[PDB]
Amino acid sequence: MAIIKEFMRFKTHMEGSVNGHEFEIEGEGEGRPYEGTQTAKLKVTKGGPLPFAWDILSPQFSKAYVKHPADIPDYLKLSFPEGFKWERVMNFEDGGVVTVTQDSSLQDGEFIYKVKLHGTNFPSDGPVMQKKTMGWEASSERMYPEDGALKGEIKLRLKLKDGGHYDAEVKTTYKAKKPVQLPGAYNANYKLDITSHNEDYTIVEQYERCEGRHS
């Protein structure tokens, strides 16, 4: 219940199910919220090893860490200490769907994230269930004010191991727990990398850089 410092830590917990496969993940991260950089270390605590591509989970692990110029109100930083919630749908090009709900708060000097995720309708021979993906390309989320919340739309592109790409259309609503100043439409430009992973992807490290700007 405080301020966002130049250096901030986070703890995260995810409960999810993908194609009937139940799991939980606990993680710890850190970064520079005003620089727009962060890292996270995630561990599968239940249901590992996962039978599907880690990549569908990585974008679910932190919008307080977006670099904003002074002219674009930082709605999601402004939401603290009480914080914000978001809800997302990812529609993959072969019919697979992920939905996610998340709550973000600031407690005792650290961000606390709680994530719930459903994935379903991934084909058994597709790249997610066959683990044939190799990270996300850099992307730009179009952010805009609507219904008193901040909305985001992204066309995400997953690289495939054997060539080509696999797309998801992503729509998210981000809502502060109390009214704070919304921005005009802008672009949130992300690069998310898996920096390490053990054999079976039960311990994974990620890095993300995100900066908001006007096009």
Nearest to 113 by CA among 195, 8, 35: 8
SS (H, E, C) the chain: CCCCCCCEEEEEEEEEEECCEEEEEEEEEEEECCCCEEEEEEEEEECCCCCCCHHHCHHHCCCCCCECCCCCCCHHHHCCCCCEEEEEEEEECCCCEEEEEEEEEEECCEEEEEEEEEEECCCCCCCCCCCCEEEECCEEEEEEEECCEEEEEEEEEEEECCCCEEEEEEEEEEEECCCCCCCCCEEEEEEEEEEEECCCCCEEEEEEEEEEECC
- Report the structure determination method: X-ray
Rounded distance between C-alpha atoms, residue 85 and residue 177, angstroms: 7
Joined tokens for residue 140: 């730009």
CA 136, 210, 113, 172 dihedral sign is negative
Question: What's the CATH code of the domain at 150?
Answer: 2.40.155.10
What domain range includes position 132? 1-215
Domain count, the chain: 1
Q: Could you tell me the CA-to-CA distances from 181 to 23, 38, 68, 176, 189 in Å, in that order?
A: 37, 24, 14, 10, 21
